[PDB]
Amino acid sequence: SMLDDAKARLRKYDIGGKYSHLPYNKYSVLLPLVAKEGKLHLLFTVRSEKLRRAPGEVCFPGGKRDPTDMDDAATALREAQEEVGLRPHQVEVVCCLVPCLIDTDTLITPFVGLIDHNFQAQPNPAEVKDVFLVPLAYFLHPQVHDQINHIFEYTNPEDGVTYQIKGMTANLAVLVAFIILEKKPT
Numbered sequence: 001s002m003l004d005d006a007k008a009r010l011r012k013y014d015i016g017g018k019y020s021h022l023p024y025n026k027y028s029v030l031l032p033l034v035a036k037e038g039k040l041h042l043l044f045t046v047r048s049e050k051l052r053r054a055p056g057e058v059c060f061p062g063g064k065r066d067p068t069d070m071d072d073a074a075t076a077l078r079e080a081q082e083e084v085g086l087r088p089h090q091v092e093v094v095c096c097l098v099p100c101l102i103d104t105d106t107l108i109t110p111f112v113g114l115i116d117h118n119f120q121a122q123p124n125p126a127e128v129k130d131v132f133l134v135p136l137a138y139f140l141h142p143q144v145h146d147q148i149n150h151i152f153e154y155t156n157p158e159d160g161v162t163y164q165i166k167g168m169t170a171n172l173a174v175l176v177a178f179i180i181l182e183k184k185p186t
């Protein structure tokens, strides 16, 4: 099946807890895969304009590890619940992808999660201005604009709204698309 095939692909790239004890400032993100209309999608947030770090940017759900978290995956799930109302029974964490090093002292660990079909986002407006889906296949043929660094523009056909996706978030989206969609019979 589509979902069993996606999980099987993802597991081959799982690094697990290999880098998880290193003494960094630690953040996790959840890359949430949603199946709709017979295709996989990624769920993104738009950060609230009131946040002082990166207001109005497109990001995956996530945030800083805290002492309650059993592990890095727990960080991702706790933050996703706070930001968009995703409950732990509504997500299956499939793997941990390559972590992202930033600012010399920070390590961001991305987890891919399969999201239940009955989940409906409840954006928390203190943190999230918007939540939206992008089909995973978009990231194989994105609409690129150069600002010099590459920016993806995705227009939602439901409503005509264009979102800019860039940086780590864009990079991770492409990675997941490659992992899941490469070398597939039609």
Ligand SMILES: O=C(Cc1ccc(F)cc1)Nc1cccc(Cl)c1
Pocket (backbone or CB within 6 Å): 027, 028, 029, 045, 046, 047, 048, 051, 059, 060, 061, 062, 063, 064, 083, 108, 127, 128
């Ligand atoms: O904060 C994140 C994930 C993230 C962590 C570290 C990082 F460097 C880059 C993204 N995500 C988020 C998305 C919406 C609202 C809020 Cl409050 C947080």
